[PDB]
Amino acid sequence: GSSGSSGMKRKESAFKSMLKQAAPPIELDAVWEDIRERFVKEPAFEDITLESERKRIFKDFMHVLEHECQHSGPSSG
């Protein structure tokens, strides 16, 4: 690590990555509270003090999952 801020941004980023590395993989009809308890014991999740922060992040992850699964942007990264 040469130069890179850390804190809230790092926490949110780590949370998303944690969900992706989850098993099984966050389904399409999955519930935040239904998957939270799965990571509730993890440090990445415990890091998020604000419950809303975890809820909002989860929703965003779901949106990307659906868009990532089905072909939408064959050009984008």
Query: Which residues, at least 6 apart from 42, have a Cβ–Cβ distance to it below 8 Å?
Result: 18
Structural determination approach: NMR
List, in sequence order, the alpha helices (H) in the chain: 8-20, 32-39, 43-46, 51-69
The dihedral over CA atoms of 33, 29, 54, 57, expressed in degrees to the nearest 10, equals 180
Structure tokens at 25: 């993989």
Structure tokens at 29: 């009809």
Question: Do 12 and 57 contact (CB within 8 A), yes or no?
Answer: yes
Burial of 54 (0-12, 13-18, 19+ CB in 10 A): buried
* Number of domain units in the chain: 1
Burial of 77 (0-12, 13-18, 19+ CB in 10 A): exposed
Domain with 61, as residue range(s), is: 1-77
Smallest CA-to-CA distance from 54 within 76, 39, 64, 70 is with: 39
Question: Tell me, what CATH number does 7's domain have?
Answer: 1.10.10.440
Structure tokens at 72: 């939408």
